[PDB]
Each structure stands twice: as structure tokens, then as C-alpha cells.
Task: inverse folding
DNA sequence: TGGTTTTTATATGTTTTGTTATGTATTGTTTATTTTCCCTTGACTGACTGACTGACTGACTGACTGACTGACTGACTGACTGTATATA
């Protein structure tokens, strides 16, 4: 919230929050779905959305792509099988042409 | 140009088959001890059969025996030949 007021400084580059309550989500691949349906409002399945999103991330340069900040909540039950989801996530977090602000709990 | 059909991706459901860990019961492993009848050890027992004692009848040398055969010698009978006798 203090960082929101810092966005209300209008001297830092505007960026956007993402609430992630996987516990207020059913199927833990819906992260990608809701991500696309809130960054675009466009509706797909995870196996299109995350892939279009990698396409959105590394294949896309900086000058128009936006900083986004995201924070994950209670990962102890989210990734219970093999953490391929969160593996994908942390695999997205390793670029130099893409910019993001990631956190978890 | 413009409407319609065909296939595909995502999502879920259905069914069969095969994988892993485990707790309980049976049975094996090692060691010590006693009994059983089969297999060695051996004298007794019963028929056996080798050397010694009897024996029994066919083979070669003792020639034998005795008839018969082989040379010699005289006896005898036939063939040869003289003495003799008779007639022209």
C-alpha cells in the first residue's frame, strides 16, 4: 500500500499487482488462466495460457511490456503433486529481457 | 464473396492389469542324545575228492612144432644098337 502511494508519486514506472490465493482457486494450473484473464481478460485453458505467456515473457522485449508484481500465498498445499506448476513459475523468473517482481509465502 | 461441415484440443469418465510393503504361520538350521536291526567276524558242520593201495588183461620175444618142400641118388624102363642067323 505504501508502494501504491509510491505509484502515486508518478516518478516510478507504473506496475500492477497480482493477488494469488491458490486456496481461493481450485485447480492449481488456473493460476495461468486467471493470469491471462486478468492481464488480458482473455479466456483459455492453462495449456494455451501459460504457453502464450512464455511467448508474452521472453519472446517480448521490454520497451512496452510492463513490470508486474506478484505474491504467492501458502504454497504447502498448492503444488502437492510434483511442483511442475511452481517449477514453471520459477523458470519464468530467470530472464534479463523480462522484468517481474515475485514473492511467495 | 458467404454460409457450413469436419477435425482437434481439452477435459473428464471407465476399465483392466500390474507394483510394492507388510505381519503371521510354517518350516528349516545347528547341536546333543538314544535305539535298531543290517553287516562283519568266527567257530561248527557236512560233503568232497587227491595220493596211496589193489589189479587185470592185452602186447612183443622164448622161438616151437611139425608138415612140407628141396637136392641127391639109385632103380628101372624105353630107345638105341650090335650079335646073330638064314638064303641065294
Result:
Amino acid at each position: 500500500k505504501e508502494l501504491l502511494s509510491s505509484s502515486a508519486q508518478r516518478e516510478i514506472p507504473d506496475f500492477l499487482y497480482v493477488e494469488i490465493n491458490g486456496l481461493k482457486m481450485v485447480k492449481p494450473t488456473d493460476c495461468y488462466e486467471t493470469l491471462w484473464n486478468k492481464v488480458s481478460g482473455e479466456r483459455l485453458t492453462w495449456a494455451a495460457s501459460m504457453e502464450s505467456l512464455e511467448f508474452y515473457f521472453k519472446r517480448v522485449p521490454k520497451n512496452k511490456k510492463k513490470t508486474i508484481v506478484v505474491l504467492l500465498d501458502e504454497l504447502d498445499a498448492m503444488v502437492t503433486k510434483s511442483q511442475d506448476i511452481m517449477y514453471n513459475f520459477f523458470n519464468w523468473t530467470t530472464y534479463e529481457n523480462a522484468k517481474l517482481i515475485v514473492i511467495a509465502v
Observations:
- Chain A has four helices and three strands.
- The first helix of chain A runs from residue 2 to 7.
- The CA atoms of residues 20 and 36 of chain A lie 13 Å apart.
